[PDB]
Amino acid sequence: MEVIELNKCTSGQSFEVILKPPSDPSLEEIQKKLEAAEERRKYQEAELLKHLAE
Amino acid sequence: MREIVHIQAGQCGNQIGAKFWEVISDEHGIDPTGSYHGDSDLQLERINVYYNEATGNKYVPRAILVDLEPGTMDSVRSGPFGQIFRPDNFVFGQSGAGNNWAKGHYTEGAELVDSVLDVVRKESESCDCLQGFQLTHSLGGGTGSGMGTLLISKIREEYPDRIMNTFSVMPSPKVSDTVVEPYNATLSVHQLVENTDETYCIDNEALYDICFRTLKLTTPTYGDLNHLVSATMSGVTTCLRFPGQLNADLRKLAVNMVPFPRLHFFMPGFAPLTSRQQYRALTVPELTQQMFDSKNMMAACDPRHGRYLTVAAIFRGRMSMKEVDEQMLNVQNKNSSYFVEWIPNNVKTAVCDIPPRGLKMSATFIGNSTAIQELFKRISEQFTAMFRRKAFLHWYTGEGMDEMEFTEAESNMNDLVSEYQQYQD
Amino acid sequence: MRECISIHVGQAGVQIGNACWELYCLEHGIQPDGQMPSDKTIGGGDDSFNTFFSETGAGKHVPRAVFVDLEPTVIDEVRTGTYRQLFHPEQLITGKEDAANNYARGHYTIGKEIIDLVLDRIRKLADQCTGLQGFLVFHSFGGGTGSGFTSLLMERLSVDYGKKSKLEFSIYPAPQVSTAVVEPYNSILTTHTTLEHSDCAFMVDNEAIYDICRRNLDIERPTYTNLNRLISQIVSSITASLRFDGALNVDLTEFQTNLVPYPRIHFPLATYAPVISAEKAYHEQLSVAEITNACFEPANQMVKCDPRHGKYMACCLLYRGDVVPKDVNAAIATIKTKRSIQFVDWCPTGFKVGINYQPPTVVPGGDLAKVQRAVCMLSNTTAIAEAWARLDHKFDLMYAKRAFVHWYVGEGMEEGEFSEAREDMAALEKDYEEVGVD
Amino acid sequence: MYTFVVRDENSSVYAEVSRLLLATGQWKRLRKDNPRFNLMLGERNRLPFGRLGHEPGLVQLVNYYRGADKLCRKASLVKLIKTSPELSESCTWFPESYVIYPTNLTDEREVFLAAYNRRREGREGNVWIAKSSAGAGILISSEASELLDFIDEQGQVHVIQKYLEKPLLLEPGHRKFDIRSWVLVDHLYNIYLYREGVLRTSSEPYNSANFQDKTCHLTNHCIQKEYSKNYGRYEEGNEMFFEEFNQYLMDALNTTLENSILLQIKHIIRSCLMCIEPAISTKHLHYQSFQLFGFDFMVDEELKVWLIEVNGAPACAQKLYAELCQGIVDVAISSVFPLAPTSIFIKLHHHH
Ligand SMILES: Nc1nc2c(ncn2[C@@H]2O[C@H](COP(=O)(O)OP(=O)(O)OP(=O)(O)O)[C@@H](O)[C@H]2O)c(=O)[nH]1
Ligand SMILES: Nc1ncnc2c1ncn2[C@@H]1O[C@H](COP(=O)(O)OP(=O)(O)CP(=O)(O)O)[C@@H](O)[C@H]1O
Ligand SMILES: Nc1nc2c(ncn2[C@@H]2O[C@H](COP(=O)(O)OP(=O)(O)O)[C@@H](O)[C@H]2O)c(=O)[nH]1
Ligand SMILES: CS(=O)(=O)NCCc1ccc(F)cc1
Ligand SMILES: [Ca+2]
Ligand SMILES: [Ca+2]
Ligand SMILES: [Ca+2]
Ligand SMILES: [Mg+2]
Ligand SMILES: [Mg+2]
Ligand SMILES: [Mg+2]
């Protein structure tokens, strides 16, 4: 039961107690993902219009 | 500012749509002349969802009245709230559709549809942010069924990413006008499978049995049936017309009610349904017991024959929201055999403070049940009983249709029945 | 002094943000008009509260915050609410139609169109900072914006602010206060794409906050306002060290150093006490031991789980009010001899304690009662993996039938992203089991 | 209408409880994967406790205590007794035991040989027994070399404990036996001891000069009914109930079952369960637990009771299924979900 690094100030204090010792995607790659999904949306919509045109 | 554009087509469509605007106009304090006279700010918070605001603080419904014959819309224009509709929003022909889906969809209807879309485009261009469209119509006639589904096809083409919603009255031999109603309903159902995000199935037989057995109306009329539709349409749209912690626009509802794109046909319900003992206060248990009782449902499908994919209940009036959850959590935990166990928490509840006119409290029921396959099975059987003998087909081949298109409607409907069946096991 | 920028995404993030800044202002003596009489340095200064507030020449203390939502109705409340004067228009960003509870709609469809604008507004706040620490990101798991757009924002923040720390305050979905059925999908999708971009995340399960409001505050049917004022007390207890003089958790980096030894396992459990109803005739004031003992009761944990059957990796005790180190250690001794606290063998069995003498501030007309001392324990237990297990199971039930999947594919997401995200969660659960179970 | 699920089809006990619940007309059974249940008759292994108590408006109850395996595992029990101050290492009613891991994998090998050599040098009886939880696989011997070598040939943790060389032998027959006590712990952590126990007796004369033939040394009901040639001779199914055993103790030893044995049994049950109460109690938990335990005791010729093990998923004696199962419904299930005596249990009061 040891207390270490006791720091005190006007607004409080803080300390540590030890009971026992121990034993990314680049900006380019994010644009591709965003545009790839935008492309799959455009494709699905074109197939909707193609169906409606028939 | 999430505006909805309302369309009503054909006799049934315009008669049911008329009462709907009558009911909700009363709830929002809008008189027949468009002037507001309510006493609560809640009545206006979401008023722009269904009404446009003109000069002089006038509120004009965002509604488009469509028909291929003048008669029905002359009645509306002379009806109670007939003066409230925008005069330009009446679009009608003179030929009629003769209860013929081909005439509404391919011949007479085609000649008029472009001018209807001109009005739709006009109302859309003035919306700050358009939620989507809602259509009221029957499937058994010619204009609402044939031209209605033609309108939907042309609205989806021009507004591919907007929500398309319909209230669809399904025909029944017990409440029938002509024998070709199964033909028109089977042809429309396929259009709805493809081009609607949500369809509220209203079966005239269910409306009839309710007026006969529950409401104890000796001789029901179309007017009586339309009173139930008005009340139900007002109940399902309460989520959209008033404020609440739920928010919920058309797309958010669809995302939570439709787990598969084609299975988007709902069974509505209402409570109370009392006969003239009408002043007795209704407790929360009785509202809940009736709301889930089949005799309170309007699809004429026994829910105990299928399974609920998703269920939404809306309670209106000043009541115990704690006791609402208790009774709802009681119906589920007492009949958990009729709820699919692979959609967690598929029963949602919402409370609204303003009750319908003349009721301390009410409950509207919205179920996406696989039991709806019984309705489509009925239509299919009646279709095939006539089509196997090609009875009455000449009315349709005379309009340019071929037998193959009927064969395809049959297969499309039987596929739909097969799709519901696989999710019921 | 180093600045912290708060980002609030979606309804839950914006409404929780509104409650926190309301509390922050009452704690620092800031008025709704931004004035702060106790601040003797007009239009400048590098005090601790300046980590969260900038200052104009006119003496206005302005939150270092950005509010983002794809629909304007929630942020309009901020524009016209009590504290409308605090923020300026650039800080409140609103779209016209939301993600409809659709992760794919908030991440791809709509996110792609608004991401660059949001980065621009954040860049404006960053240019006001002389030494930005990082970001505190508030959002829900279930919402389409909170789930889908947050993950996109986090990806770009890692690119534009590589060396900056990012902490989350995430709302875990609870059916008692939700009408959405697809929230398990959204939660798992957003945890997958956000996991490698968040340094430390504080999950709050609405179910836990809901029961606390009914049990301790005697609220039969709590509202979001009730839920949010309670959450903003926990958030304030966690961020107080950044806003007040002190030596524990003085910068966002210290949160990772003290609570997260393994990067993926960065979801500390939060436990708060005491929560006393204001409507009570008058409550007996609890002692340091009693409130510390309460930190090991499941009833006041921000996520319902059983830490007795996990393993601790770290443990912070944050006290506010009349508390001296003497009483803390005395209560800790008693608790060890009575409680089941098992640390992992590769970590010291200890507690880091911080004490702030100023007791918790309570919003006038709020539900919470003024107490003389309160504590918030931040413990990293494997037991919080129960939250992932519950969530992953619901995901499996719906995904086995591809229910609702078409809504996501329709917005341009590939079906493979579902399984790619689910497999990441299966690996996350395996990490917790390897650390906690023998 | 209450609901329950069944996730262990092999449980004879809860097969009866489920059969009784339905007979009341007030309990409905759901599919094993339906989350909307009041009561879960859960599986033995890997029961998902983390998914319990998260259904709005549903009070959920389960028939297992999370963490009670510490008491129902051969190796776990030994560690719990030696490491728990409430039981201490000098616990007087538990045979000297040691946890021994096979060399192909802490371990108490050196600690065992130390106490072994002490006994060998002191002329004392040095017969030990090795067993594990992965057995139907038991070995009894007086040589430490054979005990250790037998464990290395396996691949799971084992336990070596002193073998009671002076067991109490019934007459006529000169035969060994053990005592099974059923104990029910409800959600409030009351400890109810079933008034009916069973002596699983050996039908063979106990032989101390031959531990090779284990039929007269192991009182398991399956070993006696398979490898014993006197099965069912003295009592039906090698099972003597308390009425007879008490009458015997009076005729032969001039004492009673209560005074000579039951006081120690009730004391042992209390000590074991009270010890782990803070670890497994569900008093402030979001769900509720109960569980049926099977304690197995040994009695020596001095009328001292020793604890053998604790079974977490025990079976019952055929004659006692109806009475005990009904009792589980009364104090464990209907106490939380009431329906629309002379209790068969013995409440062991204690300080929570
Ligand atoms: N604690 C708390 N939870 C909230 C709050 N608002 C919403 N939620 C929860 O958040 C989830 C819904 O996500 P939202 O944040 O409302 O949705 P969103 O992020 O705005 O995204 P959209 O789909 O575009 O609306 C549900 O589980 C709600 O319970 C709030 O103010 N406080
Ligand atoms: N230390 C010891 N001294 C004397 N006999 C012992 C003993 N350990 C075990 N036995 C004998 O072994 C038999 C059962 O062994 P054990 O209980 O370890 O196996 P098991 O667990 O598969 C049976 P159960 O779980 O049903 O009690 C008992 O009848 C007992 O007589
Ligand atoms: N509920 C209801 N159903 C109607 C009404 N009028 C017609 N129907 C039903 O609608 C079908 C006839 O369609 P109808 O609307 O008259 O054809 P249309 O004018 O060409 O669109 C039949 O099944 C009728 O039972 C009505 O006012 N209310
Ligand atoms: C050709 S018919 O069979 O006579 N038409 C009856 C229509 C109807 C039946 C019942 C109603 F409640 C309303 C309308
Ligand atoms: Ca013409
Ligand atoms: Ca200053
Ligand atoms: Ca990073
Ligand atoms: Mg007609
Ligand atoms: Mg939102
Ligand atoms: Mg055993």
User: Is C419 annotated as contributing to ligand binding?
Assistant: no
Burial of B389 (0-12, 13-18, 19+ CB in 10 A): exposed
Residues of A in contact with C155 (CB under 8 A): 24-25, 30
D157: tokens are: 């943790």
Q: Is A37–C104 a contact, with Cβ atoms under 8 angstroms apart?
A: yes
Query: Six-digit token pair at D199?
Result: 């002596």
Q: Does one domain contain both B413 and B267? A: no
Residues B240, B266: one domain?
A: no
Domain end call among B209, B232, B259: B259
| Contact of B399 with B103, CB cutoff 8 Å | yes
Are both D62 and D186 inside the same structural domain? no
Residue C122: strand pairing partners: none
Q: List phi, psi (to 5°) of B348.
A: -115, 150
Q: How far apart are CA C375 and CA C238, in angstroms?
A: 10
Q: Which residues contact D301 (CB under 8 A, 6 or more apart)?
A: D166, D167, D168, D169
DSSP lists the bridge partners of residue C165 as C134
Identify the bridge partners of residue D2 per DSSP, sorted by sequence position.
D27
Do B253 and B193 sit in the same domain of this protein? yes
What distance in Å separates residue B302's CA from the closest CA in chain C?
A: 24
Active-site amino acid positions of C:
254
Which residues of chain B are within 8 Å of residue A48 when distances are taken between CB atoms?
Answer: 156, 160
Look at residue B8 and give its three-state secondary structure: strand
Q: How many domains does chain D have?
A: 2
C176 to D50: CB separation less than 8 angstroms, yes or no: no
Q: At which residue do the structure tokens 């959450």 appear? A: C231
In one-letter notation, the amino acid at residue B414 is: N
User: Is D310 buried (19+), middle (13-18) or exposed (0-12) by CB count in 10 A?
Assistant: buried
Tell if the CB–CB gap between C220 and B251 is shorter than 8 Å: no
Provide the CA D128 distance to its chain's centre, in angstroms.
21
Do C182 and B256 touch, CB atoms closer than 8 A?
Answer: yes
Q: Is the CB of B300 under 6 A from ligand 3?
A: no
Q: Is C258 annotated as a binding residue?
A: no
CB atoms within 10 A of CB C117: 12
Measured distance CA(C251)–CA(C249) in Å, rounded: 6
Q: Do both B286 and B174 map to the same domain?
A: no
Mutation pick for ligand 1 pocket among C105, C140, C223, C234 (CB with most ligand atoms within 8 Å) = C140
By residue count, chain B amounts to: 425
3 state DSSP class of D58: coil
Binding-face residues of A in 3-42 toward C, CB within 8 A: 3, 5-7, 9-27, 30, 34-41
- Round to whole Å and give the CA distance between A39 and A30: 14
User: Which residues of chain B neighbour C98 with C-beta distances below 8 Å?
Assistant: 249, 252
Q: Examine the domain organization and report whether B79 and B158 are in the same domain.
A: yes
Q: How was this structure determined?
A: X-ray
Q: Is D49 among the domain residues?
A: yes
What's the farthest any 2 CA atoms get from each other in chain D?
68
Tell me if C340 and D278 make a contact (CB, 8 A cut-off). Answer: yes
Owning domain of residue D51:
2-68
Contact between residue B291 and residue B367 where contact means Cβ atoms under 8 Å apart: no
Q: Which amino acid is at D298?
A: M
Q: Under 8 Å CB-to-CB from D252, ≥6 apart: which residues?
A: D171
Interface test with B, best of A45, A49, A52 (most B CBs within 10 A): A52
Residue D85 covered by a domain: no
Say what the resolution is, in angstroms.
2.3
Residues 6+ apart with CB under 8 A from A19: A1, C332, C336, C349, C350, C351
By the 10 Å C-beta count (0-12 exposed, 13-18 middle, 19+ buried), B241 is classed as buried
What is the sign, positive or negative, of the torsion defined by CA atoms of C164, C121, C230, C194? Answer: negative
* Distance of alpha carbon C363 from alpha carbon C355, whole angstroms: 21
- The H or E element containing residue B336 is none
Q: How far apart are CA A36 and CA C417, in angstroms?
A: 13
* Lookup: tokens for D4: 């329950």
- On whether both B288 and B151 belong to a single domain, the answer is no
- For residues B247 and B280, state if they share a domain: no
User: Which residues of chain A neighbour B159 with C-beta distances below 8 Å?
Assistant: none
* DSSP 8-state symbol, C29: T
Q: How many domains, chain B?
A: 3
User: Which residue's entry shows tokens 């429309």?
Assistant: B188
Residue type, B194: E
Question: Which of D3, D35, D57 is closest, CB to CB, to B329?
Answer: D57
Task: Let me know: does B153 contact B191? Beta carbons within 8 Å.
Answer: yes
- Whether the bond between B303 and the residue before it is cis, its omega within 30 degrees of 0, is no
Task: Report in angstroms the alpha-carbon separations of C360 from B356, C73, C294.
Answer: 45, 31, 17
Following DSSP, what letter does each residue of D135-191 receive, concatenated?
A: ----EEES-HHHHHHHHHTS-S-EEEEE--SSB--BTTTTB-EEEEEEEEE-TT--E
Q: Say if residue B185 is in the same domain as residue B291.
A: no
Give the contacts of C302 (CB within 8 A, at least 6 positions apart): C202, C203, C204, C205, C208, C209, C234, C269, C270, C271, C272
Interface check for B337 against chain D (CB to CB < 8 A): the answer is yes
State both tokens at A49. Answer: 């219009």
| Residue B352 near residue B314 (C-beta atoms within 8 A) | yes
CA distance B4 to B62: 7
- Distance in Å, alpha carbon of A37 to nearest chain B alpha carbon: 16
Query: Are B355 and B361 contacting, i.e. CB atoms less than 8 angstroms apart?
Result: yes
Q: Are residues B287 and B223 in the same domain?
A: no
Ligand nearest to the CA of C29: 6
Domain that holds residue B389: 372-425
C and B interact (at least 3 Cβ pairs within 8 A): yes
**Do B385 and B280 belong together in one domain?**
no
**Within-domain flag for D152:** no
Pairing of strands B198-203, B163-170: parallel
**Which residues, 6 or more positions from C211, have their beta carbon under 8 angstroms from its beta carbon?**
C299, C304
The residue type of D154 is Q
**The CATH number of the domain where D17 resides is what?**
3.40.50.11480
* Cα–Cα nearest to B372, from B312, B408, B424, B295: B424
Q: Give dist(CA C18, CA B377) in Å, integer.
A: 53
Is B104 in the same domain as B181? Answer: yes
Q: Which residue has the tokens 């800031």?
A: C30
| CA B196 / ligand 5 centre spacing (Å) | 29
User: Which residues, listed in sequence order, are joined to residue C50 by a DSSP beta bridge?
Assistant: none
Q: How many alpha carbons fall within 13 Å on the CB side of residue C335?
A: 22
Dihedrals phi, psi of C194, to nearest 5 degrees: -95, -15
Residues B346 and B388 in one domain: no
Cβ neighbours for B340, distance < 8 A, ≥ 6 positions apart: B307, B308, B309, B346, B423
Q: What is the token pair recorded at C413?
A: 């997401």
Ligand-binding annotation for C196, yes or no, is no
**Which residues in D223-259 are b (16+ Cβ under 10 Å) and which e?**
bbeeebebbeebbebbbbbbeebbeebeeeeeeebee
Quote the ligand 9 centre to C140 CA distance (angstroms): 10
Residue D308 Cα to ligand 2 middle (Å): 6
Calpha distance D119→D243 (Å, rounded): 39
CATH code: domain of residue D176: 3.30.470.20
- From residue B271, alpha-carbon distances to B292, B364, C80, C113 in Å are 9, 6, 39, 44
State how far the Cα of C306 lies from the Cα of C269, in Å rounded to an integer: 11
Asked whether residue D178 falls in the same domain as residue D63, the answer is no
Cβ atoms within 10 A of the Cβ of B358, count?
8
Tokens of A48: 């909707």
Residue D327 domain-assigned (yes or no)? yes
**What chain B residue is nearest to C408 in terms of C-alpha separation?**
B255
> Closest ligand 2 atom to the C-alpha of D178?
29
Strands D158-162 and D191-194: unpaired
Distance (Å) from the alpha carbon of C290 to chain D's nearest alpha carbon? 16
Which chain A residue shows the shortest CA-CA distance from C358? A11
Which of B334, B352, B371 is where one domain is finished? B371
Beta-carbon neighbour count of residue B171 at 10 Å?
A: 27
Whether D296 and D181 map to the same domain: the answer is yes
- The C-alpha atoms of residue B329 and residue B348 are separated, in whole angstroms, by 10
